Design a protein around this ligand. Structure first.
Ligand SMILES: [Zn+2]
Ligand SMILES: [Zn+2]
Lengths: 116, 41, 148, 56
């Protein structure tokens, strides 16, 4: 995660192990620029995800006519005008929880009960 | 006069059509009449 | 419960600042000088060739009767220069590239010795890119390496 | 459940009841759909898909 690019080379910095100072540096297999490892974690794989559950929530989601309105009150705004929609993770196993969006604070909440 | 628009099938994705004006625009029965649903939209 | 075609009865029986003048700039200059544009695409905050090097060098680097394809001049011209514009030392480097996206709606008002401007639309616009900053290549071996 | 409600209320007069009873023509589903309700339309064993984006 969090790729790093070079400068004056701009390619992406692979990690090159420093054993002597004994830490991780990021090389640049084209121009020899280097720097540290801002964190020893290198790679993630992320089988079961929980992102895209709010894909493209723009400040205009309130301006889309086709989205179903709903009346519940935002925990923050305590306003009762909010559009909502299922989780945008277009995949089969996906749950059927609801993401609301208050038209006032643009705060996102959920209809959940298992985990908020 | 901007009273009626042509709508293709792609554009149709982003509109919300009412079925008939009366039964659907104003906000808020014969049992022989068929059963419809509301202007909740 | 019926269809009433007699409705045509009722419907028949119902109805400070710096202001600067700009003039017909000489053309013979323009008949030989062509004023293009240029952009460096290295993000290098200023990247002026003032600091590039010296000297700087901007330049480019039997049968019977027959019928040929037909094509307008400009494309015939534009095509017939496939030598791009370059800058070098004798070793930092840049290479040019035609842009053509917005060659038209751009007249220029360069701050001359005075604040005024002769009137100058841009001829062309060029995207200038660096090169050989790390100067590595296996032009021959690339195929060899990419097929190991 | 709605079909059984209609079939039951038909009296022996009812001519289509008399054709079901004689086994002659028609059946329960038929009378259920004519008089009671037509029930769930379906395409490939599934309810109607979201042909438009996220709506039917
Ligand atoms: Zn680099
Ligand atoms: Zn809110």
């Amino acid at each position: 995660t969090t790729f790093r690019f070079c400068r004056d080379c701009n390619n992406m910095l692979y990690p090159r192990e420093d054993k002597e100072n004994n830490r991780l540096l990021f090389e640049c297999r084209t121009c020899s620029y280097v720097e540290e490892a801002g964190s020893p974690l290198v790679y993630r794989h992320e089988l079961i995800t929980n992102i895209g559950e709010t894909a493209g929530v723009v400040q205009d989601i309130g301006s889309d006519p086709t989205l179903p309105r709903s009346d519940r009150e935002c925990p923050k705004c305590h306003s009762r005008e909010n559009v909502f929609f299922q989780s945008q993770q277009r995949r089969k196993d996906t749950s059927m929880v609801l993401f609301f969006v208050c038209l006032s604070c643009s705060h996102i909440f959920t209809s959940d009960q298992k985990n908020k | 006069e901007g009273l009626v628009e042509y709508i293709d099938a792609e554009e149709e994705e982003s509109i919300l059509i009412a079925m008939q004006p009366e039964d659907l625009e104003p906000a808020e029965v014969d049992p022989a009449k068929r059963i419809r649903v509301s202007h909740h939209a | 419960f019926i269809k009433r075609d007699r409705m045509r009865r009722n419907f028949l029986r119902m109805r400070e600042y710096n202001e600067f003048p700009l003039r017909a700039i000489p053309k013979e200059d323009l008949e030989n000088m062509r004023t293009h544009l240029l952009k460096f695409q290295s993000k290098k905050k200023i990247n002026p060739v003032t600091d590039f090097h010296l000297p700087v060098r901007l330049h480019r680097k039997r049968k019977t009767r027959q019928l040929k394809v037909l094509d307008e001049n400009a494309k015939k011209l534009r095509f017939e220069e496939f030598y791009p514009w370059v800058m070098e030392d004798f070793y930092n480097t840049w290479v040019g590239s035609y842009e053509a996206g917005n060659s038209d709606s751009y007249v220029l008002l360069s701050v001359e010795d005075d604040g005024s401007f002769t009137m100058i639309p841009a001829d062309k616009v060029y995207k200038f890119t660096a090169r050989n900053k790390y100067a590595t290549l296996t032009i021959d071996e690339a195929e060899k390496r990419m097929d190991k | 459940k709605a079909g059984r409600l209609a079939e039951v209320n038909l009296k022996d007069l009812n001519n289509v009841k008399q054709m079901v009873m004689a086994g002659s023509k028609g059946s329960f589903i038929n009378i259920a759909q004519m008089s009671a309700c037509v029930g769930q339309q379906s395409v490939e064993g599934k309810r109607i898909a979201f042909g438009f984006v996220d709506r039917t």
